[PDB]
Design an enzyme around this catalytic site. Structure first.
Site, PDB file in Angstrom:
ATOM      1  N   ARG C 103       0.836  -1.282   0.077  1.00 19.69           N
ATOM      2  CA  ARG C 103       0.140   0.096  -0.077  1.00 19.69           C
ATOM      3  C   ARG C 103       0.904   1.063  -0.004  1.00 19.69           C
ATOM      4  O   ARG C 103       1.551   1.399   0.876  1.00 19.69           O
ATOM      5  CB  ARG C 103      -0.955  -0.162   1.128  1.00 19.69           C
ATOM      6  CG  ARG C 103      -1.546   1.255   1.638  1.00 19.69           C
ATOM      7  CD  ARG C 103      -2.711   1.461   2.357  1.00 19.69           C
ATOM      8  NE  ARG C 103      -3.607   0.665   2.071  1.00 19.69           N
ATOM      9  CZ  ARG C 103      -5.170   0.575   2.520  1.00 19.69           C
ATOM     10  NH1 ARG C 103      -5.416   1.183   3.565  1.00 19.69           N
ATOM     11  NH2 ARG C 103      -6.245  -0.290   1.926  1.00 19.69           N
ATOM     12  N   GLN C 133      -9.919  -4.208  -3.791  1.00 20.24           N
ATOM     13  CA  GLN C 133     -11.230  -3.743  -3.283  1.00 20.24           C
ATOM     14  C   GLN C 133     -12.298  -4.180  -4.128  1.00 20.24           C
ATOM     15  O   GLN C 133     -13.417  -4.636  -3.845  1.00 20.24           O
ATOM     16  CB  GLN C 133     -11.060  -2.257  -2.961  1.00 20.24           C
ATOM     17  CG  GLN C 133     -12.410  -1.969  -2.267  1.00 20.24           C
ATOM     18  CD  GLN C 133     -12.915  -2.311  -0.927  1.00 20.24           C
ATOM     19  OE1 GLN C 133     -12.088  -2.189  -0.065  1.00 20.24           O
ATOM     20  NE2 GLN C 133     -13.862  -2.908  -0.703  1.00 20.24           N
ATOM     21  N   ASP C 222     -17.388   6.512  -1.075  1.00 20.98           N
ATOM     22  CA  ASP C 222     -16.058   6.204  -0.322  1.00 20.98           C
ATOM     23  C   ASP C 222     -15.820   7.545   0.367  1.00 20.98           C
ATOM     24  O   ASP C 222     -16.316   8.789  -0.160  1.00 20.98           O
ATOM     25  CB  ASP C 222     -14.891   6.202  -1.291  1.00 20.98           C
ATOM     26  CG  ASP C 222     -13.470   5.873  -0.505  1.00 20.98           C
ATOM     27  OD1 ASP C 222     -13.516   5.435   0.989  1.00 20.98           O
ATOM     28  OD2 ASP C 222     -12.544   5.734  -1.319  1.00 20.98           O
ATOM     29  N   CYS C 254     -16.410   1.125   0.456  1.00 26.55           N
ATOM     30  CA  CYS C 254     -15.230   0.340   0.831  1.00 26.55           C
ATOM     31  C   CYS C 254     -14.772   0.617   2.416  1.00 26.55           C
ATOM     32  O   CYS C 254     -14.057  -0.343   2.863  1.00 26.55           O
ATOM     33  CB  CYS C 254     -13.959   0.844  -0.167  1.00 26.55           C
ATOM     34  SG  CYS C 254     -13.942   2.494  -0.237  1.00 26.55           S
ATOM     35  N   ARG C 282     -13.060  -8.871   1.318  1.00 26.10           N
ATOM     36  CA  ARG C 282     -11.699  -8.529   1.036  1.00 26.10           C
ATOM     37  C   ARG C 282     -10.683  -9.894   1.372  1.00 26.10           C
ATOM     38  O   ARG C 282      -9.912 -10.282   0.252  1.00 26.10           O
ATOM     39  CB  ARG C 282     -11.409  -7.448   1.737  1.00 26.10           C
ATOM     40  CG  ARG C 282     -11.904  -5.891   1.603  1.00 26.10           C
ATOM     41  CD  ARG C 282     -11.573  -5.407   0.106  1.00 26.10           C
ATOM     42  NE  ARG C 282     -10.036  -5.291  -0.065  1.00 26.10           N
ATOM     43  CZ  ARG C 282      -9.088  -4.423   0.540  1.00 26.10           C
ATOM     44  NH1 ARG C 282      -9.974  -3.315   1.305  1.00 26.10           N
ATOM     45  NH2 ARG C 282      -7.793  -4.587   0.534  1.00 26.10           N
TER      46      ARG C 282
END
Ligand code: NA
Lengths: 297, 298, 296
Positions: C103, C133, C222, C254, C282
């Site tokens: 990430r 996602q 989101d 998400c 996920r």
């Protein structure tokens, strides 16, 4: 010896036995064996006062591959020496776990930890030294050159913890070690003298890197640190010109991380004679053997 | 009951059963057995809002020793109550994992976590209490004294979370519990009254430690944590070698740690032969393994 | 393909195979099976430059449930791109581990990580996209609606990384995707154009959320300083918007959700909200992704 705090706390024979075991277990894992699990049911607390990629991942992965669980205690997790005295951490963690790894500032902190722990303590870097890194470096030299005995290793840069552990190794294997460092940034006199006391190795401290590197099997570097330091270390960058002076037999080694443009150039790091990435790998194989030894295997 | 949030959420018989299992499983591990793995295939998320050595390492190591994997979610990893509301953390983690341990500030945050979690929630310390610590303490007492019943436990210091869980234990096991605290620093009146309602234990709040310790089986301390007014008030509440001599020859010294020598306690007390702080610390793992075994149906 | 960086780096068949396996392995775990351990003896380094709950816990727990060990390298642990260059991190971790998750901020950091790694690299979010996602979201849609093909998905909010990975999906599965975003907060033109080039889906960018949601199967949001607040007036998903979307519409987000900002409490907690099953998936989607990358 319960602990692994400095390489010359062991004798020559023990060090070479551990480096032989390192090759054996490395071969086993390279073969794809995942059913040799000597550390099943064992745990390791890893105390880190500072950032780490190689030391952290090598120890956590290695312990896993041999069947155990390593705990990552980061800088703000237990705060050894600030939230809590080291003797108290040692006595608690020795009742939970089977082995402790620690990366600290003051060397005395790791001495304290070992003194008060009933389980083995392994050094993962202090302000004084970095023994598991040099153990890996020795394994790397055996694999590339064929042996450490009778080689010429030339460290260029600050007379620091890496230099201290090179001196440790020079105290148990006979080779020629040179530290080419700027005036005022020499390694600890006492540590140099202790290596000379062992009588095995030729030990030279110099301020002239262009001369030092001639004929080297290994040119080694590390980070220098401070704009004053950058000024003091002008002339100590490892560049392609220096590697040419060293000669065609010379490998380049660096414990990492590397700061290109400071202590080393991109061209050197990326050159065919650079073995920094196999070197980094060998942290896991050398340390696996070390931990095996400390835990009676 | 689904969760382990306070000791007196459970009855006497159940608490005593947990402490027996703690002994049995401890004995198994001490034997060198590593092939009893009831948590195989199970995971635990450990939410930590604060630093921790004992709670962290005991939970993570013990869960490993029983076959499972504990995740360490540090204070900046998920930021429960700041990046994300507790009800949402509870409902997500309950779908990944089999159990959640949590160390938080407001007690209400652990209650919220339990309320919205379909898996068990274990308390790893809140502003209000610390029940896994006192479970370990109780195991330690059983091992050194023989039993908790009929003893005299004297806590010297701030009337805080540790005192709250002492009062919890005193609600389920009959003993004599004394909190010797500075005036102004008494435990919560409701928690004291809840212990008294149970009718098992003799419960005293006092501001005179030198009288309180007399004949104690345990003298207990914890870090104290206007700063100047507090400093003034806690003069007289340090556990020193003189206080332990007044306590008498059968007194053990206990302290949940970390200790600050020269503040709540002296070096000489921590390191004395009657100090059992390191066995106490170990028993975090053994008590908590029995707690988790209970909560997951073993 | 060595890596999982963007959903449309794969073809339609491969993405459908992965989503099929995701269902199978989920069923296996739901049955109580803990004896399927293909990742025995494998390790994954997880590089996190930013906080995470779902990505962190789903990857670490699912790698465990399949028999491996995942390492949590947090933001201050290795400091990729600051303490040390990505190409060096890649080459070192590839020698220790079997797979790397990352990430990051700039998307180029994850491209560099993949380019210099000899092991597979999985994307755990970048400034550009978030493919794991959307793979989970696709699984969630398959379980609730029946399929992704032929649905209408309406995202309401900032044209960001989530919208980019929706466009990735719309490049490999034929559906109707609408992004209702404020003017000047549109998704990247290049990413829109790449989805249209694939020629499978109807793709619309609009500034009118009240019209866009009509007939949706999914209304997605989101998390979206002061000036930006002004422009997003009208973009909150509230109960009135969900009423406009109609009775077929699920709500998806998400997470983490900031109630009172991009969504209301009432929507998040409504019967049509599937945010928690979504989050669970996920783990199940990513398990199948990792199995694929590692040759299972
Ligand atoms: Na041991």
């Amino acid at each position: 010896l319960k602990d692994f705090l400095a390489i010359d706390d062991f004798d020559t024979a023990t060090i070479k036995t551990i480096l032989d075991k390192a090759s054996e277990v490395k071969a086993l894992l390279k073969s794809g064996e995942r059913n040799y699990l000597p550390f099943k049911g064992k745990s390791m607390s890893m105390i880190f006062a500072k950032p780490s990629m190689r030391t952290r991942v090598s120890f956590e992965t290695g312990f896993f591959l041999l069947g155990g669980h390593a705990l990552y205690l980061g800088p703000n997790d237990i705060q050894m020496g600030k939230r809590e005295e080291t003797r108290d951490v040692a006595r608690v963690l020795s009742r939970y776990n089977d082995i402790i790894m620690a990366r600290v500032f003051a060397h005395q902190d790791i001495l304290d930890l070992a003194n008060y722990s009933s389980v083995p303590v392994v050094n993962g870097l202090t302000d004084h030294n970095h023994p598991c890194q040099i153990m890996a470096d020795a394994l790397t030299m055996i694999e590339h050159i064929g042996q450490v005995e009778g080689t010429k290793v030339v460290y260029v840069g600050d007379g620091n913890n890496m230099v201290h552990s090179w001196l440790e190794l020079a105290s148990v294997i006979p080779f020629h070690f040179v530290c080419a460092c700027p005036k005022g940034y020499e390694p600890d006199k006492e540590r140099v003298s202790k290596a000379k006391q062992a009588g095995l190795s030729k030990i030279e401290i110099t301020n002239d890197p262009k001369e030092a590197v001639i004929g080297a099997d290994v040119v080694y570097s590390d980070v220098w640190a401070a704009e004053a330091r950058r000024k003091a270390f002008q002339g100590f960058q490892v560049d392609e010109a220096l590697m040419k002076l060293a000669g065609q037999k010379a490998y380049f080694m660096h414990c990492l991380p590397a700061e290109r443009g400071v202590e080393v150039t991109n061209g050197v790091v990326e050159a065919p004679y650079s073995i920094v990435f196999p070197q980094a790998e060998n942290r896991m194989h050398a340390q696996n053997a070390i931990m095996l030894h400390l835990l009676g295997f």
